Amino acid sequence: ESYCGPCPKNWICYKNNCYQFFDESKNWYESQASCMSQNASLLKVYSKEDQDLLKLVKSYHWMGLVHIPTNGSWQWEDGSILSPNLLTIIEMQKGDCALYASSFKGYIENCSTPNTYICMQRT
Amino acid sequence: LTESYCGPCPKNWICYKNNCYQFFDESKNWYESQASCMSQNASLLKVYSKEDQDLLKLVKSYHWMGLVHIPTNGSWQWEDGSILSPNLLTIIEMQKGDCALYASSFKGYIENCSTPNTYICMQRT
Amino acid sequence: MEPHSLRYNLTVLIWDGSVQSGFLTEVHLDGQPFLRCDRQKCRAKTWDRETRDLTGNGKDLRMTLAHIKDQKEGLHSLQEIRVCEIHEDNSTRSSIHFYYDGELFLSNNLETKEWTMPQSSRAQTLAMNVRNFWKEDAMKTKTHWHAMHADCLQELRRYLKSGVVLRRTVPPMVNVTRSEASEGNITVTCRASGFYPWNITLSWRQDGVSLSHDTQQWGDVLPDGNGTYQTWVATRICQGEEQRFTCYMEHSGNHSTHPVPS
């Protein structure tokens, strides 16, 4: 396909996903809401192959991963569980949310700490 | 909720604001890289606008771009021939060299053209 | 002059195994405080360029701290210290240093451009975690470091060019005085004051012959506390030999001779 879409006007297309990067830092919930206000969600990571561009991302950024201490594992805002062997989760700060960092790492951060965030629209 | 399409762009490349971009892991000198870009009716990364190419601020590591020294003046120009728009890039002296690696944010490190590095290709639409 | 320097000194903290959101980078220029940067803003102890870069470096250091094993209960610190110099020959040095709970464990400079660790068992172990951390990141080439060196020096040059750094000598004021008039002898003290830079030579001389360091009494070199220093040297002489004693000072390539005033 010479053509990539469909995507919001000034967004990044890579393999029929859309991505935007927001400089203006916000806590985990404020970020979720900013994503929701563009029929979008926080970055979900489902494939090393379809999202290999993510290896080239500088610094760290909120993604839709959230701890569920009842069973003791991670899930996305939409509800699906963490495909094992996708992310390595590193304990950094004490919290129940995770910053994505290159390459396919999640750092655990306190949900209240303002950070940059990445929104994604999927297929 | 205005739904757009991005193209025309090579298969599985990155589209953003009427430009196409790819990253190549397989490291090559400046000329080897120019030629690899030319082999997909593409060029090495040209930087003309902080607004239209703001995704470049998020780029990890260092990568060949089409900037080339013109030693009479001291000044830089792109593969295609247009001059470096002043107050776009910060040029950092790293190696004594006549080619530059792009790094985030809108920086160029001067490198020896013969040193293998990863590169970024860019097309118009 | 002695060389123009620039230092970045970035600190991240962990409390009971948790990396604190905050960090602090303190920029110093030719030794003198210049910027302090928290997560939010840089302030002069507008600075966007510094806030953009120094915040980034901060985040990057929170992660590296996370990859350190056995983070013993309580507070520990990781610092990334960058100092580059431009000498009078226009030759340049640069160093990156990592300090854990304030002890060096890893060092890169521009002449070797190799990483080199102490012999300390804890050091080798900390360097291990961190270099194994840098191995994994497919995007941490030798270039990443050679660029940190180049960056430091480009900033230092930017700061020199725009006259943020002044390289002005202040030649000393000198007063000589008579004192401790007692048992037919007198003390003569020669005080140097207000001067920069620090290095200075200041001796008593009997008949142009400079006196042994053991026959005189020397003040320390104290900061005046307005950027400058002061010091002194005195010696004990017989009353009415005072016209054979002179204080000799070398400073900022002046040489000068001050006699005992009548």
Side-chain angles (χ1 to χ4, degrees), chain B residues 11-121:
Chain B
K11 207 219 162 183
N12 286 351
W13 276 30
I14 294 166
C15 204
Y16 189 77
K17 298 186 177 176
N18 317 136
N19 311 294
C20 321
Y21 301 96
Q22 190 41 47
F23 161 70
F24 298 102
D25 35 31
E26 285 293 49
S27 20
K28 293 189 184 78
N29 66 72
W30 187 82
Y31 316 100
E32 279 186 313
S33 302
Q34 184 174 231
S36 197
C37 284
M38 287 263 127
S39 102
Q40 22 226 325
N41 220 101
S43 69
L44 286 167
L45 177 67
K46 177 190 170 206
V47 167
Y48 67 92
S49 183
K50 297 220 223 217
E51 286 70 13
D52 300 338
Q53 307 182 281
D54 58 294
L55 86 153
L56 290 189
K57 283 182 281 213
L58 277 308
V59 167
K60 202 176 192 193
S61 192
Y62 314 74
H63 310 270
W64 280 126
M65 55 176 170
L67 207 61
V68 67
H69 203 226
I70 300 189
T72 41
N73 300 307
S75 42
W76 296 89
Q77 92 171 22
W78 302 99
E79 285 190 58
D80 65 38
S82 35
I83 48 142
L84 181 75
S85 266
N87 300 111
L88 258 191
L89 292 195
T90 316
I91 262 42
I92 295 136
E93 303 156 37
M94 193 183 75
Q95 293 289 342
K96 246 140 178 162
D98 296 319
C99 294
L101 300 157
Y102 169 86
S104 167
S105 278
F106 291 77
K107 287 180 223 163
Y109 298 71
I110 298 166
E111 174 63 294
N112 321 112
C113 300
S114 288
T115 311
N117 285 106
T118 47
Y119 54 99
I120 292 163
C121 297

Side-chain angles (χ1 to χ4, degrees), chain A residues 11-29:
Chain A
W11 279 45
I12 294 165
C13 198
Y14 186 76
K15 299 184 170 177
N16 316 322
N17 313 298
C18 315
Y19 302 94
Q20 196 38 261
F21 294 108
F22 297 102
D23 323 326
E24 48 269 311
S25 21
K26 292 189 219 295
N27 64 75
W28 188 81
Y29 317 88

Side-chain angles (χ1 to χ4, degrees), chain A residues 60 92-94 107 109, chain C residues 18-19 21 39 59 62 67:
Chain A
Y60 59 38
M92 193 180 69
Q93 206 166 55
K94 278 161 175 24
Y107 289 94
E109 181 82 332
Chain C
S18 185
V19 176
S21 290
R39 212 208 227 277
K59 294 162 163 168
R62 293 185 65 234
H67 294 263

